[PDB]
Amino acid sequence: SKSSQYRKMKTEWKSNVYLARSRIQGLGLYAARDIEKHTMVIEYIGTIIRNEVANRKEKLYESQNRGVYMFRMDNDHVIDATLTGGPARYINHSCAPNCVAEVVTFERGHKIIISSSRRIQKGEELCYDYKFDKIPCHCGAVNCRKWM
Ligand SMILES: Nc1ncnc2c1ncn2[C@@H]1O[C@H](CSCC[C@H](N)C(=O)O)[C@@H](O)[C@H]1O
Ligand SMILES: [Zn+2]
């Protein structure tokens, strides 16, 4: 049951991850322990805001040469982790991910859950495919698409 998986992950995620210097860019999130395939690791949390508001914010931050932490969604909304976020905001992109950022809709709502797509060893850096629609990718993978 997704909702039981979710409830369990919500009380465990702190022991699933840690924050350290990335092998990809800046800071990154790492598996604190071994994690089985198809397992909820952590949630992307923040404040859901309309695209219009998000764009204004991004534009304001770029003026000071700062990035934002935002997970773009299909409903013209965004989860804004720039001010109130969690560790999942630090998970980097990979052309060869060990994770997926999946939509999970259930009793408690419409959530973005990061889950393992393979067995993941302690100390591996976590990453998922950001899925793009233009700056160079540093995921290091063999089949890197070179750009983001
Ligand atoms: N595979 C990749 N190659 C190059 N830059 C990446 C990347 N994955 C993530 N990033 C960078 O990280 C941002 C997502 S925020 C993720 C955490 C970030 N590494 C940090 O230290 O704050 C992107 O805007 C991009 O600047
Ligand atoms: Zn890449």
Swiss-Prot record:
- Please tell me what else the database record remarks about this protein: Found in a critical region of chromosome 7, which is commonly deleted in malignant myeloid disorders. Partial duplication of the KMT2C gene are found in the juxtacentromeric region of chromosomes 1, 2, 13 and 21. Juxtacentromeric reshuffling of the KMT2C gene has generated the BAGE genes.
Report the SS bond pairs.
Answer: none
Ranges for domain Post-SET: 134-148
This protein's assembly is summarised as: Component of the MLL3 complex (also named ASCOM complex), at least composed of catalytic subunit KMT2C/MLL3, ASH2L, RBBP5, WDR5, NCOA6, DPY30, KDM6A, PAXIP1/PTIP, PAGR1 and alpha- and beta-tubulin. Forms a core complex with the evolutionary conserved subcomplex WRAD composed of WDR5, RBBP5, ASH2L/ASH2 and DPY30 subunits; WRAD differentially stimulates the methyltransferase activity. Interacts (via WIN motif) with WDR5.
Q: What does the UniProt entry list as the effect of changing residue 138 to N?
A: Confers a WRAD-dependent gain-of-function histone H3 dimethylation activity. Converts H3K4me1 into H3K4me2
Q: State where S-adenosyl-L-methionine binds.
A: 69, 92-93
The residues that the entry says bind Zn(2+) are 95, 137, 139, 144
The record's subcellular location field reads:
Nucleus
What gene is this protein a product of?
KMT2C
Similarity comment text for this entry = Belongs to the class V-like SAM-binding methyltransferase superfamily. Histone-lysine methyltransferase family. TRX/MLL subfamily.
Domains: entry comment: The SET domain interacts with histone H3 but not H2A, H2B and H4, and may have a H3 lysine specific methylation activity.
Function field: Histone methyltransferase that catalyzes methyl group transfer from S-adenosyl-L-methionine to the epsilon-amino group of 'Lys-4' of histone H3 (H3K4). Part of chromatin remodeling machinery predominantly forms H3K4me1 methylation marks at active chromatin sites where transcription and DNA repair take place. Likely plays a redundant role with KMT2D in enriching H3K4me1 mark on primed and active enhancer elements.
SET domain residues are 15-131
> What outcome is documented for mutating residue 23 to P in this protein?
Confers a WRAD-dependent gain-of-function histone H3 dimethylation activity. Converts H3K4me1 into H3K4me2
Task: State which residue ranges cross the membrane.
Answer: none
Expression sites (tissue/organ):
Highly expressed in testis and ovary, followed by brain and liver. Also expressed in placenta, peripherical blood, fetal thymus, heart, lung and kidney. Within brain, expression was highest in hippocampus, caudate nucleus, and substantia nigra. Not detected in skeletal muscle and fetal liver.
The protein's name in its UniProt record: Histone-lysine N-methyltransferase 2C
Disease per record: Kleefstra syndrome 2: A form of Kleefstra syndrome, an autosomal dominant disease characterized by variable intellectual disability, psychomotor developmental delay, seizures, behavioral abnormalities, and facial dysmorphisms.
